[PDB]
Scaffold this active site. Structure first.
Site, PDB file in Angstrom:
ATOM      1  N   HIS A   1       0.851  -1.185   0.000  1.00  0.00           N
ATOM      2  CA  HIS A   1       0.000   0.000   0.000  1.00  0.00           C
ATOM      3  C   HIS A   1       0.883   1.230   0.000  1.00  0.00           C
ATOM      4  CE1 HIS A   1       0.700  -0.647   4.358  1.00  0.00           C
ATOM      5  NE2 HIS A   1       0.771   0.673   4.367  1.00  0.00           N
TER       6      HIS A   1
ATOM      7  N   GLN B   1      -6.233  -9.349  14.429  1.00  0.00           N
ATOM      8  CA  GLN B   1      -6.071 -10.764  14.067  1.00  0.00           C
ATOM      9  C   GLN B   1      -7.122 -11.650  14.702  1.00  0.00           C
ATOM     10  OE1 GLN B   1      -4.065 -11.107  11.709  1.00  0.00           O
ATOM     11  NE2 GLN B   1      -3.000  -9.152  11.978  1.00  0.00           N
TER      12      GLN B   1
ATOM     13  N   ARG C   1       0.486  -2.337  20.959  1.00  0.00           N
ATOM     14  CA  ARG C   1       0.306  -2.644  19.560  1.00  0.00           C
ATOM     15  C   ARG C   1       0.070  -4.138  19.349  1.00  0.00           C
ATOM     16  NH1 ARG C   1       3.740  -4.630  15.619  1.00  0.00           N
ATOM     17  NH2 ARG C   1       3.250  -3.971  13.508  1.00  0.00           N
TER      18      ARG C   1
END
Ligand SMILES: Nc1ncnc2c1ncn2[C@H]1C[C@H](O)[C@@H](COP(=O)(O)OP(=O)(O)OP(=O)(O)O)O1
Ligand SMILES: Nc1ncnc2c1ncn2[C@H]1C[C@H](O)[C@@H](COP(=O)(O)OP(=O)(O)OP(=O)(O)O)O1
Ligand SMILES: Nc1ncnc2c1ncn2[C@H]1C[C@H](O)[C@@H](COP(=O)(O)OP(=O)(O)OP(=O)(O)O)O1
Ligand SMILES: Nc1ncnc2c1ncn2[C@H]1C[C@H](O)[C@@H](COP(=O)(O)OP(=O)(O)OP(=O)(O)O)O1
Ligand SMILES: [Mg+2]
Ligand SMILES: [Mg+2]
Ligand SMILES: [Mg+2]
Ligand SMILES: [Mg+2]
Ligand SMILES: [Mg+2]
Ligand SMILES: [Mg+2]
Lengths: 480, 481, 481, 480
Positions: free
Chosen positions: A120, A256, A247
């Protein structure tokens, strides 16, 4: 003149006219129709937020930090020109994301166009180029004192790194610290994280442990190896470890999520089955596929989450298979999670081996009575690499600090100087196994294969191993 | 009497049963309004004005929430209103024993003022509870609401302090074993007290709490484990639990053990020691006690609160000049000065009996550096701080039972290796902070040299700013650079 | 000295200039740590533990934010660091004069203990500021940071209390008129003090604040109005301002004037009156003052805080038996009992001189009902509460200047009719609460009859529960039903 | 099936009964994920990404909370699990009928595209509910959980829309009258739908919500009123109720009726009108419908979502050039320009039939001022906005019943004069906004002159910036 935007995370944000001009383009406004978290909205209903708002927040934080450094130290000689370039880079680093964000570059492209290498980030740069050119932004940049030749380069380097020693052209080593702000290639500590922590938490209904405002107050620039780098106050080192702990916890809980991932996977599968029949009009009327839209930015501009509904609502019988998969999502007839396990010791699993793992599970031969026999194609195996952003490396080893008695003097802090309660390793893999056959008997069988396969490969005992496969788990001594 | 509603900022509108109200509206309980949750932390974190009183309501309410949730999910547990009220009363009452500035009192002042005695706020919570009941005719009211004071008072005390001496509890049988896990979990430390203080302290400190107790309550079930009925957590929630303790440790690192917060605690303690001989508090029958002896009479203890601090500060008695002078240095922010932090290395551990000798060791260090002033043992303060996950060297998740969705009644165990490699390898450590009572530039400069030299002598970890504060000392040690 | 950072839960990390720190670290300022912002409100809203100290930091910080924002937006204003610091010091120091339990002291206790004297916490803030400066050698430090004590001390005092006697201010000229609008806006009440307490009180009470001060700061500009330079608000933000006052009134309704909160204030006041003759506080030169005379010596006032409450509660002196007994009834929650609420009708307004006679009027009412007990004036308490938008009958938005986006330097006025018909027609009102000191069922039953009869006699509004408490009285009045 | 937990940022962890899950996992419900709660408001308030889906879960949950709380406090009510589930289903399902961009669809687009028809999202919620049940075999599942589809489907529909025609309800008797007050209170508007949107919209808009619904639930009781059993509020909570409506009005003033939010709604509407003839949506049996006729077939309506906006934006069909062009001006932020705001005076009120003629009136105004351009009716847009407390001129607290602690079972009434003089004297008003489709400086300058002149001609209130915008015009009117 300048605009004010009310953001729930940051409050009232002021936008410079140049940034407004950039924002009010089709290329930027496209980000309104791309979910930050992709399939996560299908698990966490508060997560309706899109890349657009995240991008404003990143732009604003980039501005906050560069401003704070300039106020604290004039000797840095930070100019309005620098400030605007850093902000634009902050606003524009998400420009390249595709439908459902990481699902696109993490799952779909790798499988649809395996030869190509694409991120990206790459896309953010091409889209930026396209945005500038299609909208006559260069003149406006000049009007506000920017030098497009140098500054466009600078902005792109911020997003993607060197385009090729001092490897950057857009600014000299004396302004090295400006590169640490939007996308910190050295250690990952940047304003992008800070926005998403706060913004994702607000929407997920999870609470964020990390104070970026505090970090900004203590940030200084110091000389390190003939570079001027951003340095953190020594005693803030625990907070940084916590930043990465946070994080990792957000990935474990949300990004996830086992079901979030399977939904991503199902959508990916549907996109693969639609790829031959869906057409998107690029430059000069020319036609592209979902998987080739990345080659023309005019087409990419029109590639958003909308594709999902285009397929869902289609009547073309060519798309029957693709459409059917999305319908099973709506009815919540999803592939079924079977379990989770991890490799042991030094064992690590490479990307080339991923395709062969369903076959391994199907090959396991558990000493148990089974109604159905299952095949490789019935199994999905997701491999997830969890780290602190630098594979096996500790990012705090790549952070420079200062102490209150000598604020201009940069220093290093080792883990052993902080705490024994920190992690000894900074990377791991998770393996999730799912079954495409949903019925009780297929699922019962799938569990036996799975747990057997874990035992065969000397993987960690699934947490529910004894309950789901009581006849398999006894064979392994280590497990009990 | 019927039920009352209280608005709490952390928990919203909380309902209180009339019995709890009656307990609450006593001098013994209302006393908690004048005891800061975080003691000297308010002098660093100005939002931390909160007192033990509100924390206690929150604990009472969360206790109620969890027991109610278990009973709703499983009727077969046969949880009675009587059980619910006993658990709530224990929740409300486990902080009754705290003294002025909370942990400062039992952590610092009593150990130094009455070294022979062994005392904890838990002990006190029980004595104060007994006193509260008796001084206010609560027993009749307990009976009126269907409680059996003989059994239930025992139950409530056991919840707070553990067995008062198989099954070691008398207040309830093994079939209700899980009720003991709620207010003060001696097995693994996962209890509603933590949950209240996480949320409440964060809201006040201006730090953000990572732990979702409401989620945990939704996933909590009771299962059989070793012929006991214990509270079990859903398997997949195991990460959240590791995070709970990570959060707790981070709150201690940032706030509860803030270097300046601790030195203020220390200074207040010192002032209390110097006032102890002259301050008198009227206990039972007009009899008179000291700050350090008030713990022997609950009538006197009732009157011992943070107010003592201002009694001393505002005193005119010349007897108290020294004590008063110390508090004045706090107001002017002339505080003992932090010198630095370090940790022991390898297997090395430091015992409580050695604590008194450490200032002397630092003063004995002989750094090869030019010094104006020479410093003495009495000029140094050495705070030793034991950080753990609540069970010394042990991992509390090894003492937790789980269940999975395919067999919700079947308890199981999960090992660390089944969760993540990114978890800690150790679960306890010590921090050593050194401070200097001489504040001037030269004494401080000197103190840094002793400190760093002493770290080197003892093979401790290199203070983070070692090279900056003591550049002439740090080179001698190879390991450090 | 260099700058400090403080973490506040409301505002986050606040930077303090060394000069402010020096001011803060004095006994006169640190005193505010032992004065509850909301006084007796903590006894109703347990989250409201907060003290004037933290509120004062927040006010200081917001004052800084606004002045900074104006200077950034318009350099032509010529705002100096000197101006910034003076405004911040005024913000920090406007609560210096508050007494024990804040508004309880100047609102209730002084008026009753020293009726001849006229006194406000604002007066006190100035005297305490003077005292603080002089007792701590702050003037030299002001000079060191580029302040001119002659002019600037005057400026700071004017910000707090207004002119010390046209341009009536000496500390700064008409070209800096807008600096006076920040800390304590005498023109329309829109100032940073409100903004802090809205946010801070809400956070603690567990009520949610409707008003966005950050937004208001972004829109604020300075324009010329009547040869003054005044702070002006963007036209379209006018609704938000009406909401600001609506919010303020709602906070009073729900919290600051809670019926029980007020009775507790009243009970504490009564206890202070009964202790006033026996409590002594050492002022200047060892000289001794009373609670009620401490306001005459700042050295004594410095030592007058919430602590007084506990000094009395914990006293053994039999002189204080009566005062002490009252505080004990608070702890046991045997409070005076709320009887009801009503308002005057039409043009009727009640003056302060009439307050003493109202208990007598209620006792004089003669309801046609059967009563066990007959009640006396001294059994009744009548609290009269004036609710307004800060300017008695006046609308403060009529005293606000606006600007529009097409002409940002051109100030304008906006009338109520230009905003909405859904706004209030009046901006002031009175509430009357009646309480009874006799708590038993029969006295309370009687008290209700008097009360409702008295409301009918005086043509007041029908208490909301009038029909239920006193059915036999309410029928007589036609208007009520 | 057993119960599910969902994490909502507003409400935390919400438990869902298997029956509700079954209803939720249908195309007809999942459709709400692609309909913005606030429509065009997201284009002004970038935090407002939220959709009707999550709002619906929250409404369902609060409905459950309240009914549960009443049953716990008073067993004598005899509230059954059956009653609880019916109330929850009604809560979940009252937003089912909303169209693209929510209120834009039924507030603007349908009235203009199908003027003869009378239609509301409430009507649609019922038809969509019927469709949802039938298309998914939900009736059997209702029976399995102890519901009686004959009675209960009726009950649920009555909760949403009122009586389908003395006690006018069939689904439950007068003794359970209070169950109708929960999801959609036709008597006074105090219901759980408001409570969800207050909290949810505020969270997303970054405005703060003044109203405590949890408190209200704790103090709610049922009492007899006029031989009905109605929900009653504790007397002293009356101020909080006035504040509830004040808060509602302030949310409309700041957000739901933001001048630019509304013009964006208008522009989208206009684009939909121009696309209506060419866009086709496949309904029942392959039959084809328009955007404006999809409301007649629920199978087609199911596919009508915010996606339409992008279908048009991305279209290549030259038929849609005009419609597409409008959306592009939105992306470039070339919007119609707000000219100003005013209100009628005294008794004057403006009826819906007059709305079409107002642009013509403004264009007819002849200001005594020098103008470059002359403007036409079609260049002007005039939006009329009716603001109230939910019951036109009526005060909803006059339609609320209270109780006191001394006599909890005894209902009573409280008048405004018994509360405060600081309350509003009126409970309804109109706002007039004027916008110009010609955006250039000279057209806009002119438009302001017409506008202000027109206000003066009609004896409307003086626009707040009148003197600055039209200094010549403003002086003629004495009153101003
Ligand atoms: N009263 C309010 N409170 C909070 N946020 C608001 C309020 N009004 C608007 N917002 C939000 C919506 C926008 O994101 C942002 C700026 O909107 P607004 O101030 O109305 O700008 P605008 O562009 O519509 O007005 P103009 O162009 O006239 O200056 O603030
Ligand atoms: N308007 C309000 N909004 C939010 N919280 C409130 C409000 N009023 C009171 N509270 C809080 C303060 C208390 O902690 C708690 C109980 O208040 P309240 O219901 O006023 O009890 P009370 O005992 O004064 O009333 P009563 O005894 O008449 O029922 O709720
Ligand atoms: N890790 C943290 N996270 C959030 N707030 C913190 C943290 N550490 C401290 N605080 C708060 C406590 C104080 O109100 C404020 C300043 O504290 P801190 O940064 O510790 O200053 P300090 O004076 O103790 O250190 P020094 O003087 O060495 O800079 O921040
Ligand atoms: N750690 C977490 N903290 C907060 N919310 C979470 C967490 N993990 C998941 N959620 C959210 C996502 C969903 O909205 C909701 C339920 O998810 P989860 O409990 O994982 O159910 P699940 O259906 O995926 O698991 P299972 O079916 O195994 O119980 O809670
Ligand atoms: Mg990144
Ligand atoms: Mg009460
Ligand atoms: Mg403990
Ligand atoms: Mg004021
Ligand atoms: Mg599940
Ligand atoms: Mg309605």
């Amino acid at each position: 003149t300048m605009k004010v935007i009310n953001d729930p995370i940051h409050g009232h944000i002021e936008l410079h006219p140049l940034l407004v001009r950039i924002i009010d383009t089709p290329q930027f406004q496209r980000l309104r129709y791309i979910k930050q978290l992709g399939g996560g909205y299908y698990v966490f209903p508060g997560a309706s937020h899109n890349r657009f708002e995240h991008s404003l927040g990143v732009g604003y934080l980039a501005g906050c930090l560069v401003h704070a450094l300039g106020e604290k130290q004039p000797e840095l000689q930070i100019s309005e020109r620098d400030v605007l370039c850093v902000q634009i880079a902050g606003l524009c680093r998400n420009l390249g994301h595709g439908p459902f964000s990481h699902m696109f570059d993490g799952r779909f492209i790798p499988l649809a166009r395996p030869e190509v290498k694409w991120t990206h980030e790459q896309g953010s740069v091409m889209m930026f180029e396209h945005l500038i050119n299609s909208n006559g932004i260069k003149p406006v940049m000049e009007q506000y004192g920017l030098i497009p030749e140098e500054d466009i380069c600078f902005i792109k380097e911020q997003i993607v790194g060197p385009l090729e020693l001092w490897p950057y052209k857009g600014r000299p080593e004396n302004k090295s610290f400006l590169y640490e702000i939007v996308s910190n290639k050295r250690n990952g500590i940047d304003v992008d994280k800070w926005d998403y922590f706060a913004r994702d938490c607000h929407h997920l209904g999870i609470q964020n442990n990390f104070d970026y405002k505090r970090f900004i107050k203590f940030a200084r620039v110091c000389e390190v190896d003939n570079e001027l780098r951003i340095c953190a106050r020594d005693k803030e080192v625990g907070n940084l470890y916590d930043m990465f702990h946070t994080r990792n916890s957000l990935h474990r809980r949300a990004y996830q999520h086992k079901v979030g991932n399977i939904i991503d996977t199902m959508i990916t599968d549907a996109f693969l089955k639609a790829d031959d029949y869906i057409e998107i009009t690029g430059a000069g009327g020319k036609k592209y596929r979902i998987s080739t839209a990345i080659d023309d930015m005019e087409a990419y501009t029109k590639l958003t989450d909308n594709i999902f509904l285009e397929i869902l609502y289609s009547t073309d019988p060519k798309l029957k298979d693709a459409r059917e998969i999305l319908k099973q999502i709506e009815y919540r007839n999803l592939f079924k999670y079977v379990g989770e396990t991890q490799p042991t010791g030094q064992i690590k699993i490479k990307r080339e081996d991923y395709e062969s793992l369903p076959k391994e599970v199907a090959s396991a031969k558990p000493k148990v009575l089974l109604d159905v026999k299952l095949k490789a194609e019935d199994f999905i195996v997701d491999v997830i690499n969890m780290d602190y952003g630098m594979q096996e490396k500790n990012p705090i080893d790549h952070v420079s600090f200062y102490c209150k008695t000598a604020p201009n003097r940069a220093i290093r802090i080792t883990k052993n100087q902080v705490s024994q309660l920190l992690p000894e390793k900074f990377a791991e893999q998770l393996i999730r196994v799912y079954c495409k056959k949903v019925d009780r008997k297929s699922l019962y069988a799938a569990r036996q294969y799975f747990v057997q396969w874990c035992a065969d490969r000397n993987f960690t005992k699934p947490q529910d191993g004894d309950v789901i496969a009581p006849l398999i788990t006894p064979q392994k001594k280590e497990w009990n």
